[PDB]
Design an enzyme around this catalytic site. Structure first.
Site, PDB file in Angstrom:
ATOM      1  NE  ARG A   1      29.176  26.380 -26.816  1.00 20.23           N
ATOM      2  CZ  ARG A   1      30.046  25.935 -26.104  1.00 20.23           C
ATOM      3  NH1 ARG A   1      30.826  24.746 -25.344  1.00 20.23           N
ATOM      4  NH2 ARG A   1      31.019  26.455 -26.240  1.00 20.23           N
TER       5      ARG A   1
ATOM      6  CE1 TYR B   1      25.239  29.009 -26.153  1.00 18.54           C
ATOM      7  CE2 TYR B   1      26.995  30.106 -27.354  1.00 18.54           C
ATOM      8  CZ  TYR B   1      26.383  29.249 -26.161  1.00 18.54           C
ATOM      9  OH  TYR B   1      27.257  28.571 -25.614  1.00 18.54           O
TER      10      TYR B   1
ATOM     11  CE1 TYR C   1      23.246  30.601 -10.530  1.00 15.74           C
ATOM     12  CE2 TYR C   1      24.895  29.731 -11.582  1.00 15.74           C
ATOM     13  CZ  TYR C   1      24.448  29.474 -10.058  1.00 15.74           C
ATOM     14  OH  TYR C   1      24.341  29.198  -9.497  1.00 15.74           O
TER      15      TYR C   1
ATOM     16  CG  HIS D   1      29.177  40.345 -13.983  1.00 15.64           C
ATOM     17  ND1 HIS D   1      28.600  40.495 -15.662  1.00 15.64           N
ATOM     18  CD2 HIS D   1      29.974  41.055 -13.557  1.00 15.64           C
ATOM     19  CE1 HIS D   1      28.884  41.831 -15.935  1.00 15.64           C
ATOM     20  NE2 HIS D   1      29.462  42.582 -14.686  1.00 15.64           N
TER      21      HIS D   1
ATOM     22  CB  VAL E   1      31.383  36.988 -16.388  1.00 13.10           C
ATOM     23  CG1 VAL E   1      32.224  35.462 -15.573  1.00 13.10           C
ATOM     24  CG2 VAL E   1      31.621  38.860 -15.731  1.00 13.10           C
TER      25      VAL E   1
ATOM     26  CB  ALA F   1      32.264  32.000 -10.489  1.00 19.69           C
TER      27      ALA F   1
ATOM     28  CB  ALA G   1      30.621  29.866  -6.255  1.00 23.67           C
TER      29      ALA G   1
ATOM     30  CB  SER H   1      35.591  22.746 -10.727  1.00 23.35           C
ATOM     31  OG  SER H   1      34.984  21.972 -10.114  1.00 23.35           O
ATOM     32  CB  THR H   2      37.206  28.425 -10.071  1.00 24.22           C
ATOM     33  OG1 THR H   2      36.209  27.805 -11.391  1.00 24.22           O
ATOM     34  CG2 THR H   2      38.296  29.560 -10.599  1.00 24.22           C
TER      35      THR H   2
END
Ligand SMILES: Nc1ncnc2c1ncn2[C@@H]1O[C@H](CSCC[C@H](N)C(=O)O)[C@@H](O)[C@H]1O
Lengths: 53, 255, 262, 66
Positions: free
Chosen positions: B66, B70, B92, B94, B97, B124, B200, B227-228
């Site tokens: 990763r 980046y 995507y 904010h 975030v 989200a 969301a 999922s949250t």
């Protein structure tokens, strides 16, 4: 495009959202979505949608 | 040149700010880190000069770290800025975030003496409050990344609405890990405490996932990256008689 | 009759969502609660049929419990809905973040069998993350209304960001005034000093409302908070005082150790 | 002028092109939109209260008592 163009319009336009919520099937067909697509929306099958356009 | 990072919010087309959309429209070049193809198609029609940074991820089942990827994304953004282009990055939700690449690029652009800023967008979390009809201010609010909550000592205040993000990868350095999360949470919350799995919506035809279930059942729930977990308060607010005393008042004085 | 609650964000004009703006334009009537006169004008050009909810706040000299103010706002909104108007309530920021009027109106409309929903907007907190260069997802974050933090038993996690909203009325118990005093603030400092040193750097944040305005980002020691100039619009960020601590109990269950945390 | 001020701030708030132009040459962009000397001075000094005067003119929506 079609599905994309429709989803784009729907998501930005409060008036279209209004029309949509009153009669989803008719509005979707008016914007050229297919029976398969319409069915995916009304069933809430997001997966099948991805595989349509 | 210059850099501006904007967010699209969660909902296609409709949830981006008016100014943020304008930034994309008027950009010399747009770097996108958008999730799906509807999002991508929509962006391309705002501005044809789009570079999809998702390309930097592993391709054809290759192996790629990763942090290396980046770095390539950020370097690609900065190259545009250095070249003199009015550069816009479209993220995507904010853009600051769950987003290291925005922060990194802005940081590096500043250090090289370029104008660089982050425009806020709808996260989200913002969506959660609206969809569940909950005010974070009602009894307070605490948000943690679920893994951080497991790896480090973060004692929740059970009068608050507790949010645990990226629940799907909780405890990754599975039902087994979620069971461990349940036992952890069971220090403050009963096993029959109703919690909510929230996702969301990203399409205007799509209802948000709002699944209410006992805490004990969490391990057997199907989860997605988005999922949250919402854990409502387990205790009512109680008066701080000490501070009220210092204030020279009592509960009866509260209007 | 129907009700849609939308936020307008903090900045003039540009920080409202495209969909939210559309809602205002197509509305029969808009109830507004906006930061300033520039915003009011902008709204009116979007949709001229605006009722300003400001009027329900206590006028110069009047003593009014804000519970009443909020109750009268909600009632005014519902009267429109009940009369058969496609009603939009336009609130600055996010219409459901440290704002009761929208949740109340929606709850009531639903209870009376009307269609009602809330659209998310850009809150002062969303602005704060952007302006300070913080990723709240990874770091975690907490929010409390300052007064509620004083009056009720809240226990913060000093390892993660702590936001105190409405710091300008911290400790104002009557709900009839719109500012607090240095001595009230001093008590808040004393309360906070259980977890945060007196010389801990805190940040008084105010998002810009106009595009020509820089945000207020005032760094100061916590001890100095009682002497600070506060606006109704001020928020207090208290960064971590303690370093992260390993959850040994849970690490052991996961079969990993502090050394493996990567 | 008062109306013109409001209209400028409104456009500036929504229009990214105008925004980037503003940040490059604030005074020049402001003059090209018909702002006066003292409007520009007020902007440059950051005197928000003057701006409201020149346009010609309580935000708590929550409580914490339970
Ligand atoms: N521009 C701004 N900068 C910082 N904090 C702000 C702000 N505007 C509002 N706030 C915060 O919000 C409180 C008012 S309550 C209104 C909250 C609004 N719906 C929102 O989403 O922001 C203030 O006391 C402060 O804590």
């Amino acid at each position: 495009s079609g599905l994309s163009d429709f989803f784009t319009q729907l998501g930005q336009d409060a008036q279209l959202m209004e029309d949509y919520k009153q009669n989803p099937e008719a509005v979707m067909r008016a914007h050229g979505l297919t029976d398969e697509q319409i069915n995916a929306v009304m069933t809430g099958d997001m997966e099948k949608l991805k595989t349509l356009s | 040149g210059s850099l501006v990072c904007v967010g699209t919010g969660l909902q296609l087309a409709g949830q981006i700010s008016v100014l943020s959309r304008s930034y994309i429209e008027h950009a010399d070049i747009v770097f996108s880190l958008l999730p799906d193809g509807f999002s991508q198609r929509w962006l391309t029609k705002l501005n044809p000069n789009v570079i999809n940074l998702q390309q930097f991820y592993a391709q054809n089942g290759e192996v790629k770290n990763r942090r290396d990827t980046y770095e390539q994304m950020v370097n690609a953004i900065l190259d545009a800025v250095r070249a003199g282009k009015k550069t816009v990055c479209a993220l995507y939700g904010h853009p600051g975030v769950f987003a290291c690449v925005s922060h990194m690029a802005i940081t590096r652009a500043k250090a090289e003496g370029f104008s660089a800023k982050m425009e806020p967008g709808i996260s989200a979390e913002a969506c959660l409050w609206a969809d569940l009809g909950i005010d974070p201010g009602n009894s307070g609010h605490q948000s943690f990344e679920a893994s951080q909550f497991m790896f480090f000592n973060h004692v929740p205040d059970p009068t608050t609405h507790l949010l645990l993000w990226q629940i799907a990868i909780a405890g990754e350095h599975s039902s087994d890990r979620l069971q461990i999360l349940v036992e952890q949470l069971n220090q403050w919350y009963p096993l029959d405490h109703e919690v909510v799995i929230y996702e969301a919506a990203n399409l205007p035809i799509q209802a948000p996932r709002i699944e209410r279930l006992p805490l004990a059942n969490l391990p057997q729930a199907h989860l997605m990256p988005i999922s949250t977990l919402l854990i409502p308060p387990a205790k009512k607010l109680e008066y701080n008689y000490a501070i009220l005393a210092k204030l020279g008042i009592g509960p009866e004085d509260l209007g």
